[PDB]
Short mmCIF file of C-alpha atoms and ligand atoms in Angstrom, two decimals:
data_model
loop_
_atom_site.label_atom_id
_atom_site.label_comp_id
_atom_site.label_asym_id
_atom_site.label_seq_id
_atom_site.Cartn_x
_atom_site.Cartn_y
_atom_site.Cartn_z
CA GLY A 247 47.91 28.06 20.96
CA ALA A 248 46.22 29.83 18.21
CA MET A 249 48.86 32.47 18.06
CA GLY A 250 51.82 29.73 17.95
CA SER A 251 52.39 30.62 14.03
CA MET A 252 52.84 34.52 14.47
CA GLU A 253 55.71 36.32 14.80
CA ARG A 254 56.57 37.99 18.41
CA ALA A 255 57.12 41.17 16.69
CA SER A 256 53.93 41.31 14.84
CA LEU A 257 52.07 40.18 17.96
CA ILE A 258 53.43 43.03 19.71
CA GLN A 259 52.80 45.31 16.78
CA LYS A 260 48.85 43.84 16.50
CA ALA A 261 48.64 44.63 20.72
CA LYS A 262 49.29 48.04 19.92
CA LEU A 263 46.89 48.03 17.31
CA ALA A 264 43.89 46.45 19.33
CA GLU A 265 44.73 48.82 22.37
CA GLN A 266 43.91 51.86 19.64
CA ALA A 267 40.71 49.96 18.35
CA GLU A 268 39.28 49.34 21.89
CA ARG A 269 39.85 45.79 20.93
CA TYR A 270 41.20 44.38 24.67
CA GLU A 271 40.10 40.81 24.40
CA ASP A 272 42.33 40.56 20.95
CA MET A 273 44.66 42.83 22.90
CA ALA A 274 45.41 40.09 25.74
CA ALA A 275 44.90 36.99 22.88
CA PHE A 276 47.82 38.72 21.11
CA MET A 277 50.03 39.54 24.01
CA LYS A 278 49.14 35.83 25.64
CA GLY A 279 50.94 34.68 22.14
CA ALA A 280 53.98 36.86 22.86
CA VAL A 281 54.41 35.83 26.00
CA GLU A 282 54.13 32.06 25.25
CA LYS A 283 57.19 32.85 22.80
CA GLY A 284 59.19 32.15 26.30
CA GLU A 285 61.48 35.33 25.98
CA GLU A 286 61.48 37.66 28.49
CA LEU A 287 58.98 40.94 28.16
CA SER A 288 60.65 44.27 28.00
CA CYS A 289 58.90 47.43 30.16
CA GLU A 290 56.98 48.56 27.25
CA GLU A 291 55.53 44.69 26.53
CA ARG A 292 54.87 44.13 30.19
CA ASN A 293 52.62 47.48 30.09
CA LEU A 294 50.79 46.36 27.42
CA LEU A 295 49.87 42.97 28.95
CA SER A 296 49.07 44.55 31.94
CA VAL A 297 46.65 47.06 30.15
CA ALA A 298 45.38 44.25 27.82
CA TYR A 299 44.21 41.91 30.76
CA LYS A 300 42.99 44.84 33.30
CA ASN A 301 40.38 46.29 30.65
CA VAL A 302 39.39 42.50 30.07
CA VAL A 303 38.91 41.58 33.78
CA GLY A 304 37.62 45.36 34.11
CA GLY A 305 34.22 44.69 32.07
CA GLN A 306 34.19 41.05 33.83
CA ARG A 307 34.20 42.77 37.21
CA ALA A 308 31.87 45.21 36.31
CA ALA A 309 29.32 43.17 35.11
CA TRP A 310 29.69 40.65 37.39
CA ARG A 311 29.16 43.22 40.53
CA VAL A 312 25.96 44.06 38.73
CA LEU A 313 24.31 40.64 38.60
CA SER A 314 25.48 39.83 42.13
CA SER A 315 23.34 42.99 43.31
CA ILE A 316 20.57 41.58 41.15
CA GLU A 317 21.30 38.46 43.04
CA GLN A 318 21.30 39.81 45.99
CA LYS A 319 18.15 42.16 45.65
CA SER A 320 16.15 38.88 44.69
CA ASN A 321 16.86 36.96 48.14
CA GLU A 322 15.74 40.04 50.19
CA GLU A 323 12.19 39.43 52.59
CA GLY A 324 9.24 40.03 49.97
CA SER A 325 11.29 39.69 46.45
CA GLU A 326 9.30 37.55 44.06
CA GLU A 327 10.52 34.33 43.23
CA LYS A 328 12.38 34.69 39.77
CA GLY A 329 13.94 31.16 39.47
CA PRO A 330 17.36 30.38 38.57
CA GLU A 331 18.36 32.39 36.15
CA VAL A 332 20.21 35.13 37.69
CA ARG A 333 22.39 33.03 39.53
CA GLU A 334 22.96 31.19 36.24
CA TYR A 335 23.94 34.01 34.75
CA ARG A 336 26.17 35.47 37.50
CA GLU A 337 28.09 32.07 37.67
CA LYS A 338 28.41 32.36 33.90
CA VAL A 339 30.03 35.62 34.21
CA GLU A 340 31.63 34.75 37.53
CA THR A 341 33.07 31.23 35.52
CA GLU A 342 34.56 33.48 32.56
CA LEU A 343 36.18 35.95 35.09
CA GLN A 344 37.57 33.13 36.95
CA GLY A 345 39.19 31.75 33.38
CA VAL A 346 40.78 34.69 32.79
CA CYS A 347 42.58 35.21 36.12
CA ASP A 348 43.89 31.78 35.85
CA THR A 349 44.87 32.21 32.30
CA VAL A 350 47.10 35.26 33.73
CA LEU A 351 48.09 33.42 36.73
CA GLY A 352 49.45 30.64 34.48
CA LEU A 353 51.41 33.38 32.42
CA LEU A 354 53.09 34.91 35.29
CA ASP A 355 53.77 31.08 36.61
CA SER A 356 55.05 29.52 33.44
CA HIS A 357 57.57 31.37 33.51
CA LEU A 358 57.17 35.28 33.41
CA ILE A 359 57.83 35.29 37.30
CA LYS A 360 60.85 32.84 37.63
CA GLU A 361 62.58 34.50 34.87
CA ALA A 362 62.54 37.75 36.10
CA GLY A 363 65.65 38.90 37.75
CA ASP A 364 65.65 42.63 37.50
CA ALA A 365 63.71 44.05 40.59
CA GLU A 366 61.36 46.20 38.10
CA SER A 367 60.19 42.68 36.36
CA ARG A 368 60.18 40.58 39.37
CA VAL A 369 57.83 43.27 40.85
CA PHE A 370 55.57 44.15 38.18
CA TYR A 371 54.54 40.31 37.51
CA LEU A 372 54.29 39.78 41.33
CA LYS A 373 52.01 43.14 41.91
CA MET A 374 49.93 41.44 38.79
CA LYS A 375 50.00 37.86 40.84
CA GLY A 376 48.22 39.66 43.77
CA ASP A 377 45.89 41.53 41.83
CA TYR A 378 44.67 38.56 39.71
CA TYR A 379 44.37 36.69 43.00
CA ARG A 380 42.80 39.60 44.45
CA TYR A 381 39.97 39.41 41.65
CA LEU A 382 39.73 36.01 42.17
CA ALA A 383 39.08 36.61 46.03
CA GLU A 384 36.32 39.24 44.97
CA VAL A 385 34.22 36.38 44.29
CA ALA A 386 35.47 33.30 46.35
CA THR A 387 32.94 31.95 48.81
CA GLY A 388 33.98 28.24 49.33
CA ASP A 389 36.80 26.18 51.38
CA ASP A 390 39.45 27.97 49.27
CA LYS A 391 38.53 31.65 50.00
CA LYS A 392 41.11 31.81 52.69
CA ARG A 393 43.77 30.66 50.60
CA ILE A 394 42.94 32.62 47.69
CA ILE A 395 43.46 35.77 50.06
CA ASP A 396 46.46 34.32 51.39
CA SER A 397 48.06 33.84 47.85
CA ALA A 398 46.95 37.31 46.84
CA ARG A 399 48.65 38.62 50.49
CA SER A 400 51.60 36.81 49.50
CA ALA A 401 52.45 38.11 46.40
CA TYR A 402 52.07 41.45 47.30
CA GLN A 403 53.88 41.17 50.57
CA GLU A 404 56.88 39.61 48.33
CA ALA A 405 56.67 42.68 45.80
CA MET A 406 56.67 45.14 48.67
CA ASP A 407 59.74 43.40 50.36
CA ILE A 408 61.59 43.89 46.63
CA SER A 409 60.22 47.42 45.64
CA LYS A 410 61.23 49.07 49.26
CA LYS A 411 64.65 47.43 49.01
CA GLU A 412 65.19 47.86 45.33
CA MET A 413 63.39 50.65 44.12
CA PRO A 414 62.58 54.49 45.17
CA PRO A 415 59.30 55.42 46.87
CA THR A 416 58.37 57.33 43.70
CA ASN A 417 58.72 54.57 41.31
CA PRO A 418 55.32 54.29 39.52
CA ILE A 419 55.11 50.41 39.78
CA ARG A 420 55.76 50.33 43.68
CA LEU A 421 53.31 53.44 43.97
CA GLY A 422 50.58 51.23 42.17
CA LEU A 423 51.82 48.44 44.26
CA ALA A 424 51.12 49.77 47.48
CA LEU A 425 48.03 51.38 45.89
CA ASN A 426 46.42 47.96 45.11
CA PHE A 427 47.77 46.37 48.32
CA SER A 428 46.04 48.70 50.55
CA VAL A 429 42.67 48.30 48.76
CA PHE A 430 43.36 44.54 49.12
CA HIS A 431 43.36 45.53 52.74
CA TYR A 432 40.28 47.57 52.99
CA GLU A 433 38.08 45.24 50.44
CA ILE A 434 39.33 41.74 51.08
CA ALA A 435 41.03 41.41 54.17
CA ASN A 436 38.94 43.55 56.31
CA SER A 437 41.91 45.53 57.41
CA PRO A 438 40.56 49.20 57.01
CA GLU A 439 43.38 50.74 59.27
CA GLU A 440 46.06 48.62 57.53
CA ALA A 441 44.98 50.11 54.48
CA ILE A 442 44.63 53.90 55.27
CA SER A 443 48.31 53.30 57.32
CA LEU A 444 49.79 51.82 54.22
CA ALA A 445 48.27 54.54 51.85
CA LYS A 446 49.59 57.29 54.23
CA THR A 447 52.84 55.96 54.64
CA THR A 448 52.99 55.12 50.85
CA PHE A 449 52.02 59.05 49.82
CA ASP A 450 54.56 60.70 52.43
CA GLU A 451 57.08 58.52 51.42
CA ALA A 452 56.57 59.68 47.61
CA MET A 453 56.45 63.09 48.49
CA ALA A 454 59.71 63.21 50.37
CA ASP A 455 61.00 61.77 47.12
CA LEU A 456 59.37 64.20 44.28
CA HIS A 457 62.24 66.83 44.55
CA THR A 458 64.62 63.85 42.78
CA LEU A 459 62.62 63.70 39.55
CA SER A 460 62.58 65.24 36.04
CA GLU A 461 59.11 66.82 35.11
CA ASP A 462 57.48 63.99 33.27
CA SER A 463 58.90 61.54 36.05
CA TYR A 464 57.14 63.68 38.38
CA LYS A 465 53.67 63.45 36.58
CA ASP A 466 53.71 59.69 36.31
CA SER A 467 54.32 59.43 40.22
CA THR A 468 52.13 62.14 40.85
CA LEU A 469 49.37 60.83 39.06
CA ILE A 470 49.06 57.52 41.17
CA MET A 471 49.48 59.53 44.34
CA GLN A 472 46.68 61.43 43.67
CA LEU A 473 44.57 58.02 43.86
CA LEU A 474 46.53 57.32 47.21
CA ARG A 475 44.78 60.64 48.51
CA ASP A 476 41.35 60.15 46.77
CA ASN A 477 41.07 56.44 48.65
CA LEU A 478 42.40 58.22 51.86
CA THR A 479 39.39 60.87 51.33
CA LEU A 480 36.81 58.08 50.46
CA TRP A 481 37.82 55.90 53.93
CA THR A 482 38.33 58.57 56.13
CA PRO B 214 32.96 55.94 44.41
CA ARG B 215 34.62 52.80 44.33
CA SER B 216 37.97 52.53 45.56
CA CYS B 217 40.89 53.14 42.92
CA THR B 218 43.41 50.81 41.77
CA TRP B 219 45.97 51.16 39.17
CA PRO B 220 46.21 50.55 35.98
CA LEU B 221 42.60 51.79 35.52
CA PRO B 222 40.64 50.50 32.81
CA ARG B 223 39.72 52.70 29.34
CA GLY C 198 23.19 26.07 19.04
CA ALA C 199 24.35 26.24 22.58
CA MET C 200 21.04 28.03 23.79
CA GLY C 201 18.82 24.99 22.40
CA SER C 202 18.42 23.61 25.74
CA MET C 203 16.96 26.88 27.58
CA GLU C 204 13.98 28.03 27.64
CA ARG C 205 12.62 31.02 25.56
CA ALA C 206 11.73 32.76 28.77
CA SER C 207 14.68 32.22 30.55
CA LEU C 208 17.33 33.76 27.43
CA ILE C 209 14.81 36.74 27.36
CA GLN C 210 14.93 37.09 31.03
CA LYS C 211 19.24 36.71 30.58
CA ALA C 212 19.20 39.02 27.58
CA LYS C 213 17.48 41.85 29.56
CA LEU C 214 20.31 40.97 32.33
CA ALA C 215 22.96 41.05 29.92
CA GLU C 216 21.79 44.49 28.60
CA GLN C 217 21.87 45.85 32.46
CA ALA C 218 25.55 44.02 32.49
CA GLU C 219 26.39 45.54 29.38
CA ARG C 220 27.23 42.32 28.07
CA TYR C 221 26.05 42.89 24.59
CA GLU C 222 27.75 40.00 23.05
CA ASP C 223 25.66 37.56 25.53
CA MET C 224 22.72 39.67 24.84
CA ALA C 225 22.85 38.73 21.28
CA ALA C 226 23.49 35.40 21.95
CA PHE C 227 20.47 35.15 24.15
CA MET C 228 18.64 36.62 21.49
CA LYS C 229 19.60 34.44 18.97
CA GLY C 230 18.62 31.62 20.80
CA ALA C 231 14.97 33.11 21.51
CA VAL C 232 14.59 33.81 17.53
CA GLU C 233 15.35 30.02 16.99
CA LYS C 234 12.84 28.96 19.13
CA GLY C 235 10.83 29.42 15.86
CA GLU C 236 8.05 31.77 17.86
CA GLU C 237 7.59 35.02 16.21
CA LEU C 238 9.09 38.18 18.71
CA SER C 239 7.05 40.66 20.75
CA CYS C 240 7.55 44.57 20.53
CA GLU C 241 10.08 44.51 23.41
CA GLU C 242 11.39 41.09 22.17
CA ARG C 243 12.41 42.68 18.75
CA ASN C 244 13.83 45.77 20.53
CA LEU C 245 16.27 43.65 22.63
CA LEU C 246 17.16 41.61 19.59
CA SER C 247 17.99 45.36 18.01
CA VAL C 248 19.98 46.60 20.72
CA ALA C 249 22.03 43.46 21.28
CA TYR C 250 22.95 43.12 17.51
CA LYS C 251 23.60 47.24 17.16
CA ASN C 252 25.65 47.03 20.23
CA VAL C 253 27.69 44.37 18.97
CA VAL C 254 28.19 45.14 15.19
CA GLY C 255 28.84 49.16 16.81
CA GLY C 256 32.42 48.16 18.77
CA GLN C 257 33.13 46.34 15.78
CA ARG C 258 32.58 48.87 13.18
CA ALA C 259 34.41 51.86 15.33
CA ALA C 260 37.38 49.42 15.69
CA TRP C 261 37.49 48.64 11.16
CA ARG C 262 37.18 52.55 11.32
CA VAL C 263 40.33 52.99 13.29
CA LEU C 264 42.18 50.22 11.35
CA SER C 265 41.27 50.93 7.89
CA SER C 266 42.60 54.50 9.03
CA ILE C 267 45.72 53.57 9.80
CA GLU C 268 45.90 51.27 7.03
CA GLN C 269 45.32 54.27 4.43
CA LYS C 270 48.12 56.18 6.17
CA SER C 271 50.13 53.47 6.19
CA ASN C 272 49.81 53.39 2.10
CA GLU C 273 50.58 57.25 1.64
CA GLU C 274 53.58 58.59 -0.06
CA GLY C 275 56.23 58.63 2.41
CA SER C 276 54.84 56.27 4.79
CA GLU C 277 57.44 53.59 6.31
CA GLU C 278 56.84 49.95 5.35
CA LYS C 279 55.44 48.01 8.06
CA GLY C 280 54.58 44.87 7.03
CA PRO C 281 51.32 42.90 6.66
CA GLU C 282 50.35 43.11 10.18
CA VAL C 283 47.78 46.13 10.05
CA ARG C 284 46.11 44.61 6.83
CA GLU C 285 45.92 41.62 8.57
CA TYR C 286 44.38 42.61 11.58
CA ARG C 287 42.00 45.16 9.83
CA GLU C 288 41.14 41.63 7.71
CA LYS C 289 40.39 39.91 11.42
CA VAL C 290 38.19 42.26 12.42
CA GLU C 291 36.17 42.84 9.24
CA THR C 292 35.56 39.24 9.10
CA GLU C 293 34.17 38.98 12.18
CA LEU C 294 31.98 42.05 11.61
CA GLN C 295 30.75 40.26 8.20
CA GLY C 296 30.11 37.14 10.44
CA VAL C 297 27.54 39.16 12.57
CA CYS C 298 26.17 40.58 9.84
CA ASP C 299 25.57 37.20 8.21
CA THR C 300 23.81 35.86 11.56
CA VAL C 301 21.53 38.66 11.98
CA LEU C 302 20.70 38.51 8.10
CA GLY C 303 20.62 34.99 8.72
CA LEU C 304 17.84 35.17 11.59
CA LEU C 305 15.92 37.76 9.37
CA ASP C 306 15.40 35.11 6.55
CA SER C 307 15.09 32.17 8.83
CA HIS C 308 12.21 33.39 9.33
CA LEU C 309 11.57 36.60 10.95
CA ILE C 310 10.56 38.63 7.90
CA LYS C 311 8.22 35.85 6.39
CA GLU C 312 6.49 35.48 9.57
CA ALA C 313 6.01 38.73 10.30
CA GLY C 314 2.57 40.01 9.18
CA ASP C 315 1.70 43.07 11.05
CA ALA C 316 3.04 46.17 9.42
CA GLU C 317 5.16 47.01 12.55
CA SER C 318 6.87 43.74 12.84
CA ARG C 319 7.50 43.54 8.87
CA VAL C 320 9.06 47.13 8.68
CA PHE C 321 10.97 46.58 12.05
CA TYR C 322 12.43 43.50 10.51
CA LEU C 323 13.19 44.92 7.21
CA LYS C 324 14.67 47.69 8.49
CA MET C 325 16.98 45.68 10.17
CA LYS C 326 17.79 43.86 7.03
CA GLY C 327 18.84 47.30 5.07
CA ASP C 328 21.16 48.13 8.19
CA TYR C 329 23.23 44.87 8.11
CA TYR C 330 23.71 44.88 4.30
CA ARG C 331 24.50 48.75 5.18
CA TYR C 332 27.21 47.40 7.43
CA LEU C 333 28.36 44.86 4.91
CA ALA C 334 28.45 47.51 2.05
CA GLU C 335 30.71 49.83 4.63
CA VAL C 336 33.58 47.23 4.31
CA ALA C 337 32.90 45.84 0.85
CA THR C 338 35.20 46.23 -2.21
CA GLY C 339 34.74 43.28 -4.46
CA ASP C 340 32.42 41.89 -7.32
CA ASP C 341 29.43 41.78 -5.03
CA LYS C 342 29.44 45.52 -3.46
CA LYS C 343 26.99 46.72 -5.91
CA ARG C 344 24.61 44.05 -5.12
CA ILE C 345 25.10 44.28 -1.28
CA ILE C 346 24.29 48.19 -1.77
CA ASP C 347 21.30 47.16 -4.14
CA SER C 348 20.34 44.33 -0.97
CA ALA C 349 20.46 47.35 1.60
CA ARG C 350 18.46 49.76 -0.77
CA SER C 351 15.73 46.75 -1.47
CA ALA C 352 15.08 46.01 1.86
CA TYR C 353 14.89 49.95 2.96
CA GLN C 354 12.51 50.54 0.10
CA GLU C 355 10.15 47.75 1.01
CA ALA C 356 10.15 49.07 4.61
CA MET C 357 9.51 52.48 3.22
CA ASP C 358 6.73 51.38 0.93
CA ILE C 359 5.01 49.53 3.67
CA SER C 360 5.37 52.41 6.68
CA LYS C 361 4.11 55.02 4.32
CA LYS C 362 1.02 53.03 3.79
CA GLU C 363 0.19 51.61 7.44
CA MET C 364 1.98 53.84 9.81
CA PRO C 365 1.76 57.29 11.07
CA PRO C 366 4.48 59.63 9.99
CA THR C 367 5.53 59.91 13.90
CA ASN C 368 5.91 56.24 14.24
CA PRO C 369 9.49 55.65 15.87
CA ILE C 370 10.20 52.78 13.76
CA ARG C 371 9.22 54.54 10.49
CA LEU C 372 11.11 57.70 11.89
CA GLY C 373 14.37 55.71 12.40
CA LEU C 374 13.99 53.86 8.81
CA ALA C 375 13.80 56.81 7.24
CA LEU C 376 16.96 58.09 9.27
CA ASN C 377 18.95 55.36 8.68
CA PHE C 378 17.89 55.06 4.50
CA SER C 379 19.04 58.76 4.47
CA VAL C 380 22.03 58.07 5.85
CA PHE C 381 22.43 55.22 3.48
CA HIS C 382 21.75 57.62 0.62
CA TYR C 383 24.13 59.95 1.92
CA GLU C 384 27.34 57.29 3.20
CA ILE C 385 27.11 54.43 0.69
CA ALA C 386 24.76 55.42 -2.08
CA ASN C 387 26.94 58.64 -3.12
CA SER C 388 23.65 60.48 -3.29
CA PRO C 389 23.66 63.50 -0.95
CA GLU C 390 20.61 65.07 -2.09
CA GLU C 391 18.48 62.18 -1.93
CA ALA C 392 19.63 61.98 1.74
CA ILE C 393 18.69 65.79 2.49
CA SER C 394 15.38 65.35 0.74
CA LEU C 395 14.58 62.41 2.62
CA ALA C 396 15.59 63.51 6.12
CA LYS C 397 13.57 66.97 5.61
CA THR C 398 10.80 65.78 4.24
CA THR C 399 10.39 63.15 7.17
CA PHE C 400 10.73 65.33 9.48
CA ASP C 401 8.27 67.59 8.16
CA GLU C 402 5.99 65.15 7.86
CA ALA C 403 6.53 64.12 11.36
CA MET C 404 6.41 67.78 12.77
CA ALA C 405 3.02 67.92 11.18
CA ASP C 406 1.19 64.80 13.16
CA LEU C 407 2.88 65.09 16.55
CA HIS C 408 -0.52 67.33 17.64
CA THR C 409 -1.92 63.79 17.95
CA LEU C 410 0.34 62.06 20.22
CA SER C 411 0.20 61.83 23.71
CA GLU C 412 3.05 63.30 25.92
CA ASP C 413 5.05 59.86 25.71
CA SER C 414 4.54 59.30 22.39
CA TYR C 415 5.82 62.88 21.39
CA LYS C 416 8.91 62.23 23.31
CA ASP C 417 9.55 58.86 21.45
CA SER C 418 9.17 60.78 18.19
CA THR C 419 11.20 63.61 18.88
CA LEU C 420 13.99 62.44 19.95
CA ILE C 421 14.30 60.52 16.66
CA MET C 422 13.33 63.97 14.74
CA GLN C 423 16.58 65.43 16.67
CA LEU C 424 18.54 63.18 14.73
CA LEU C 425 17.21 64.11 11.23
CA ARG C 426 17.81 67.29 12.51
CA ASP C 427 21.17 67.25 13.53
CA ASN C 428 22.02 65.10 10.06
CA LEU C 429 20.33 67.86 8.23
CA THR C 430 22.67 70.28 9.79
CA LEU C 431 26.02 68.11 9.39
CA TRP C 432 24.95 68.11 5.59
CA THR C 433 23.93 71.79 4.90
CA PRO D 182 30.42 64.35 13.63
CA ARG D 183 29.40 61.06 12.33
CA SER D 184 25.86 60.77 10.79
CA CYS D 185 23.66 59.70 13.28
CA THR D 186 21.61 56.38 12.91
CA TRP D 187 19.21 55.07 15.25
CA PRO D 188 19.31 52.93 17.34
CA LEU D 189 22.33 54.31 19.04
CA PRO D 190 24.27 51.88 20.83
CA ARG D 191 25.41 52.74 24.56
S1 LIG E 692 58.06 50.87 30.00
C1 LIG E 692 58.76 52.76 29.54
C2 LIG E 692 58.79 53.40 30.31
N1 LIG E 692 57.60 54.04 31.30
C3 LIG E 692 57.38 53.07 32.47
O1 LIG E 692 58.46 52.67 32.75
C4 LIG E 692 55.86 53.20 33.57
C5 LIG E 692 56.31 54.55 33.88
C6 LIG E 692 55.23 55.12 34.78
C7 LIG E 692 54.16 55.16 34.36
N2 LIG E 692 53.71 53.44 34.14
C8 LIG E 692 52.89 52.99 35.10
O2 LIG E 692 52.35 54.13 36.19
C9 LIG E 692 52.29 51.74 35.08
C10 LIG E 692 51.50 50.99 33.84
C11 LIG E 692 51.06 49.68 34.37
CL1 LIG E 692 50.52 49.21 32.85
C12 LIG E 692 51.14 48.96 35.15
O3 LIG E 692 50.54 47.73 35.49
C13 LIG E 692 51.23 49.94 36.41
CL2 LIG E 692 51.49 48.83 37.84
C14 LIG E 692 52.10 51.04 36.78
C15 LIG E 692 54.53 52.64 33.29
S1 LIG E 693 7.72 47.77 22.42
C1 LIG E 693 6.69 48.43 23.58
C2 LIG E 693 6.35 49.80 23.10
N1 LIG E 693 7.63 50.67 22.63
C3 LIG E 693 7.82 50.88 21.40
O1 LIG E 693 7.09 50.58 20.61
C4 LIG E 693 9.00 51.62 20.63
C5 LIG E 693 8.65 53.19 21.04
C6 LIG E 693 9.31 53.97 20.65
C7 LIG E 693 10.82 53.86 20.76
N2 LIG E 693 11.51 52.88 20.24
C8 LIG E 693 12.51 52.95 19.39
O2 LIG E 693 12.50 54.37 19.19
C9 LIG E 693 13.23 52.00 18.58
C10 LIG E 693 13.85 51.09 19.21
C11 LIG E 693 14.57 50.33 18.46
CL1 LIG E 693 15.77 48.69 19.48
C12 LIG E 693 15.15 50.14 17.25
O3 LIG E 693 15.68 49.14 16.52
C13 LIG E 693 14.34 50.89 16.82
CL2 LIG E 693 14.40 51.55 14.69
C14 LIG E 693 13.40 52.07 16.93
C15 LIG E 693 10.80 51.32 20.62
MG1 LIG E 694 31.27 29.98 41.11
MG1 LIG E 695 54.07 48.87 57.29
MG1 LIG E 696 37.81 41.46 3.62
MG1 LIG E 697 10.71 60.52 -1.96
#
């Protein structure tokens, strides 16, 4: 890897600089290099990894949605034939997106998840695994779509089982996991009632635990809790 | 709106 | 070039899709491929080329400024030594920026400018040449800085001379050229009075010609005229 | 503010 000659600490330092500079592709490459050093990631380092790749894949997903919408309109009755270019370019962006997802899933499988013994780190990585299979599922159409969907479901479910056993209901990773698994149910699994049930139960159990928190923890938790409410408002 | 997930890209 | 096998028309079609998708690196690569087909560019195609590379270099310049500011603070009295990483990463972004500028300047020199006989196209390309030498000058520090600055000045001046002879004072390319040359004077050449004089004269000569314009042309011209006024307000 | 130039990136 091109980051193999750079010190781990220098890679983390540069990931933070890349974030400040809004250079998220660079950020992700620095954090991939850090992961490939083979040591476990600290809490802050996990956050850098997550933020980096979320921003990269976020741009790709937004572009894919623009192009897929154009492609869909091109295939409506009465639409002029424009040739293969829209499909080709949608496929180009899709393949790049799938590559990023495969890269993240590869870091998680080699070997972040297996070395993660603490509940917080294990849940963090399993949530990421669910998320990146979910992004693969958003673009999937072939023989493998059902298995991609079930890979997302399985990772999210394992994360949920651990987080319920080992973390308080206000834990921000637990909350973000439940938020994203609820969106998985709504958007990917065609299970809107499961999505709504999960969002509501997650919100109510967190509400009931806020009294235990410091002011700073209360801010972290209520920020994600508002996203659960926002989704419930969209969906009901 | 698009459904919210977390973390949110900048 | 990787675009050598794609039809010119397909490259232009995909540049427009990339713009819609906010995929400006792709946009620029498609338009480079189109230029390398060797035919002159139409008005709309010139605009696509300009928008594509302006967005790419705009992100790089913003990142470079963030990193240069951090580097400057690191070199102030009392600042803790942090090692080479800030300089290294600033240099990385700088080298990438210089590469983009060199790529654009190479397209202009081979062979957009020499084949541009109409005043509108020639001025358009010479303004771009001034702009990308100006971006090189923003980061330049070595033996060549003065010559980079004079290359920007010389391209802008030739564009100005042609535009004054051949285009009305409200022409949007003429206006954008004068706007950018005025910023060159203020920011690069350490000539704020020249910058202010040029902005004011450009604004007043355009004001006096607005009566000749259609509503749509009036909108194009007054939009850039407002940027001249905005700069005059910042500078006075 | 930073001085305005044209065109402006999105
Ligand atoms: S790492 C030092 C202490 N901070 C944290 O533990 C968490 C605290 C609460 C806020 N966080 C998140 O909400 C969060 C960030 C990221 Cl990058 C994620 O991917 C997820 Cl799921 C949650 C950081
Ligand atoms: S190409 C078809 C007609 N449109 C145009 O001629 C111009 C008209 C006025 C608005 N334009 C600009 O303001 C302009 C765009 C771009 Cl991409 C530039 O680089 C510059 Cl200098 C000016 C397009
Ligand atoms: Mg495909
Ligand atoms: Mg349940
Ligand atoms: Mg350098
Ligand atoms: Mg003069």
